[PDB]
Design a protein around this ligand. Structure first.
Ligand SMILES: CC(C)c1nn2ccccc2c1C(=O)[C@@H](C)N
Ligand SMILES: O=C(O)/C(O)=C\c1ccc(O)cc1
Ligand SMILES: O=C(O)C(=O)Cc1ccc(O)cc1
Ligand SMILES: O=C(O)C(=O)Cc1ccc(O)cc1
Ligand SMILES: [Cl-]
Ligand SMILES: [Cl-]
Ligand SMILES: [Cl-]
Ligand SMILES: [Cl-]
Ligand SMILES: [Cl-]
Ligand SMILES: [Cl-]
Ligand SMILES: [Cl-]
Ligand SMILES: [Cl-]
Lengths: 114, 114, 114
């Protein structure tokens, strides 16, 4: 799986260890091997949520399977929790787009997962 | 709705009020409340369009519904118009990917919209 | 079509002419004219792959058609090859998401491709 967070929070406010924490927490939530998990954090962005530039985040989680109604609610609680605790972003100023990818549409190591 | 613009135009060339104008115009266009609209502008990017690095933009609009043939043509006219007027980007150097998101696949506020 | 590469490798390590090389190689691979190919490279990113901050890349290729099982395997070999040779990123630390876009969902030049 791949998790991306884009935020207007400045780089200095992203605490040490954040990428590792995301990796560990996502491995456990998705059930996928930790070696599979990619994480990407993009601070200092020019963004607004509801017209306001108070701290906010726009995120995505791509996975081959492990995406669905109940699973996505669980991921959102986990991820909003982390963004609130670590980046001080209110959960109501976070969007997360979930993508269930077909194995044939994910390239890795010169080939695909298909 | 979430709207993202990635561009090679420099930050100083993004005028005051641009995020607010996008928020307002997208609210009117999508029929969604502005409180729900997120906008994200990413200037100073290393990009090429059609084999040149003249001003260009790669964008996305995600919405739960309000996506379709005629609607997307209307959004493109609106958004290319704004990018041309405000960022001086030629409409023929803009791509906008449209995504009709299922409510279960959009996380917000510790849950999803499902 | 549109190709995006996000990577932790430094900007200075991206060779002069890399964008043009991607443009031409993708034109040949997809059979699409170079005038329609957009490329976007984002260096110096805060990212991890398998919990490791060694060089890695997260990429996407969007195309109207020319996406599928065999084609994506071929694109993956091509693109991992280029990232390895030019950016010194190991293929086993690259993900590429493939998207077959409907023409109605791709905006361009005040309209869509539909
Ligand atoms: C092909 C599949 C098993 C696989 N996918 N994948 C994605 C990211 C990191 C490692 C791996 C991995 C492996 O365990 C090596 C042994 N091929
Ligand atoms: O679309 C909506 O109804 C909304 O209010 C929010 C939204 C957030 C993210 C996204 O990818 C799509 C919609
Ligand atoms: O889920 C798996 O098995 C992966 O290898 C993860 C993954 C899923 C979707 C993506 O867009 C990127 C990576
Ligand atoms: O496939 C084509 O015909 C294209 O015009 C290139 C393209 C395809 C999909 C995109 O999201 C962006 C550009
Ligand atoms: Cl589920
Ligand atoms: Cl539930
Ligand atoms: Cl898919
Ligand atoms: Cl429509
Ligand atoms: Cl129409
Ligand atoms: Cl969806
Ligand atoms: Cl194919
Ligand atoms: Cl589509």
């Amino acid at each position: 799986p791949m998790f991306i967070v884009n935020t207007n929070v400045p780089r200095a406010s992203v605490p040490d260890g954040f990428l590792s924490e995301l990796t560990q927490q996502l491995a456990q939530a998705t059930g996928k091997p930790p070696q599979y998990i990619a994480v990407h954090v993009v601070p200092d962005q020019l963004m607004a949520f509801g017209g306001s530039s108070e701290p906010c985040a726009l995120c995505s989680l791509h996975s081959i399977g492990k995406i669905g109604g109940a699973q996505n609610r669980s991921y959102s609680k986990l991820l909003c929790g982390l963004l609130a605790e670590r980046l001080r972003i209110s959960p109501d100023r976070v969007y997360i787009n979930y993508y269930d990818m077909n194995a044939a549409n994910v390239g890795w190591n010169n080939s695909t997962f298909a």
